């Protein structure tokens, strides 16, 4: 087994940690057994070949900005995430994360990963979102940004309804060679 170092970056209350615990422990978010350690090591099969994808998780608040530079080297691929039902988090991909990671390791590829797609339809979310006068993000405008930001692909997924979950990680590990 050859090991891949993948790294995940983006906001914190967006629920990317949720997506990740969901995929590496095979569990619905409700049933995750919490751990006091970070980073998750998952075994994935692609093109008929098993590899162990190591995931280095980084939370997103500005305080940690200085220590995070240290875990970047030899990363085969990055995963840069937003939430479709959090517009303010869509912007932060343009204004915070993509320029950062691009500035450190320009040539290393990445994805834009839309999360909480189950929520985009729900009436409660979209109405209380319209109170604040914002609409949820369509994969149209997000793939507009994929084809805008030198993004390898825009992929989306739901940790709650289990939709598109496998696809994100397959697309990562394959874009790492």
């Amino acid at each position: 087994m050859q090991t891949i170092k993948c790294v995940v970056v983006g906001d914190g209350a967006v629920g990317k940690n949720c997506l990740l615990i969901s995929y590496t422990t095979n569990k619905f978010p409700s049933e995750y057994v919490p751990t006091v350690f970070d980073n998750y090591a998952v075994t994935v099969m692609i093109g008929g070949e098993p590899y162990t994808l190591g995931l280095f998780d980084t939370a997103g608040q500005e305080d940690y900005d200085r220590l995070r530079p240290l875990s970047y080297p030899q990363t085969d691929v990055f995963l840069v995430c937003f939430s479709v039902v959090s517009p303010s988090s869509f912007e932060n991909v343009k204004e915070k994360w993509v320029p950062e990671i691009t500035h450190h390791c320009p040539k290393t590829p990445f994805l834009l990963v839309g999360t909480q797609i189950d929520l985009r339809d729900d009436p409660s979310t979209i109405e209380k979102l319209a109170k604040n006068k914002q609409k949820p993000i369509t994969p149209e405008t997000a793939e507009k940004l994929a084809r805008d930001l030198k993004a390898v692909k825009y992929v989306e997924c739901s940790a709650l309804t289990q939709k598109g979950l496998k696809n994100v990680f397959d697309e990562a590990i394959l874009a790492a060679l």
């Binding site: 350690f37 980073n39 098993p50 939370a59 220590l67 289990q162």
Partner: protein, 433 residues
């Protein structure tokens, strides 16, 4: 649609009838397995046919496999079912060749030798040396494979899932039944839960079927009668300490298993999740009615047991697991840095989760310590000593592997580890290396 009910139908048909019908249906089962990619279940079907024929010939007086079905006990103990009843030896042997075709395709290489042994004895008596030579070459080639792949990820036997059905006037023969589903290799909870939902929804209507994601025991009284329910939960094969000694290889870890386990979280506060001082987890071992691999890929759960772990046991467990895992990582002949730095950095530089020193804060400080049972704190102290130990051993191991592209990462690991020592000290009031 639904290859799973079709097999159980054919199998249910295989009782109250004649030997030849039992055969006809197992063969049918096998071609469904074959065509659905469940190659181990295709092989267990051919072996049941072999045992049927052997047994029927034995009872008829036709005469190693003259013994009966016991001839095959070493492939699988399920074969004992064929003991509860125009064939001949050449039909028997060919059934054993079908078996071998599918042991090969099912990557269960380790059994080809056992299935070939009776066949070799048929060809000793007919002095057929070319077939002996073929047979021996085959077994040879089979162990060559085992040598290449045993205890590695190149051979993927399956992922198991509890599936339980609940809906009063919806499910018919599976209503209230609980199953283990053996799914093809690396199938995820996301994949298996979505196929079940789309199957039964084509069955009962688009938005009438609900997945139960909770892993607690479903009490049916609490179910909205307007829907059909499918509880789906990842499980791994469960083993006793004796057993864990007695199974060396991954295949032995997947061969003849009827017990499975899954962990459910809960808090004394009645929630599912909570801080480290109140988080518990229940461990549940389901027991099937038949070992895997079997003539079908899903098997009923006939009994169940569970034990519960308090927060201090949750910490004892999870800390022991990382110490061992980090050791195992530093004993290995070829340490791969990426897995090392991942597990090491994931101990000393946590930025998302609480961190190990949360267990140290909750359980080892003197005030919080008096509350819990003494021998548990005394154990947890030693394990945590060993944890700082393994951490230092890993930091030194990893210092050799660095190519100075990420030199300072090793420094920052050091500073974080030393902070962790100072705090662990003031908490335990010991110097801790």
């Amino acid at each position: 649609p639904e290859m799973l009910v079709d097999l159980q139908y054919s199998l249910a048909n295989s009782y109250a009838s004649t030997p030849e019908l039992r055969r006809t249906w197992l063969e049918s089962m096998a071609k469904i397995h074959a065509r659905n990619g469940d190659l181990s279940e295709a092989a267990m079907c051919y072996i049941h046919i072999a045992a049927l024929i052997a047994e029927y010939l034995k009872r008829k007086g036709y005469w190693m496999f003259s013994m009966g079905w016991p001839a095959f006990l070493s492939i699988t103990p399920n074969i004992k079912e064929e003991g509860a009843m125009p064939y001949n030896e050449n039909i028997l042997v060919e059934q054993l060749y079908m078996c071998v075709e599918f042991l090969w395709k099912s990557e269960r290489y380790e059994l080809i030798a056992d299935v070939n042994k009776p066949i070799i004895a048929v060809f000793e008596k007919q002095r057929d040396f070319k077939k002996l030579s073929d047979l021996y070459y085959d077994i040879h080639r089979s162990y060559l494979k085992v040598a290449e792949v045993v205890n590695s990820e190149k051979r993927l036997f399956g992922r198991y899932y509890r599936v339980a059905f609940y809906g009063q006037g919806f499910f018919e023969e599976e209503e209230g039944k609980e199953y283990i589903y053996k799914e093809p290799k690396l199938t995820g909870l996301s994949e298996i839960s979505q196929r079940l939902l789309k199957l039964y929804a084509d069955k009962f209507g688009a938005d009438n079927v609900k997945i139960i994601q909770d892993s607690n025991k479903v009490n049916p009284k609490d179910l909205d009668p307007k829907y059909a329910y499918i509880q789906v939960t990842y499980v791994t094969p469960f083993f006793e300490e004796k057993e864990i000694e007695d199974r060396k290889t991954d295949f032995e870890m997947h061969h003849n298993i009827n017990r499975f386990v899954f962990e459910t979280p809960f808090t004394l506060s009645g929630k599912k999740h909570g801080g480290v001082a109140e988080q518990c987890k229940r461990r549940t071992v389901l027991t099937t009615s038949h070992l895997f691999p079997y003539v079908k890929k899903r098997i009923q759960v006939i009994s169940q047991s569970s034990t519960e772990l308090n927060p201090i046991e949750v910490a004892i467990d999870e800390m022991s697991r990382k110490v061992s895992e980090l050791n195992q990582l530093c004993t290995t002949e070829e340490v791969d840095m990426i897995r090392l730095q991942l597990k090491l950095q994931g101990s000393v530089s946590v930025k998302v989760n609480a961190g190990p020193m949360a267990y140290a804060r909750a359980f080892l400080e003197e005030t919080n310590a008096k509350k819990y049972p003494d021998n548990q704190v005394k154990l947890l102290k030693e394990i945590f000593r060993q944890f700082a130990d393994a951490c230092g051993q890993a930091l030194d191991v990893n210092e050799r592997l660095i190519k100075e592209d990420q030199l300072e990462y090793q420094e920052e690991l050091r500073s974080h580890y030393k902070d962790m020592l100072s705090e662990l000290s003031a908490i335990m009031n010991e110097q801790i290396t």
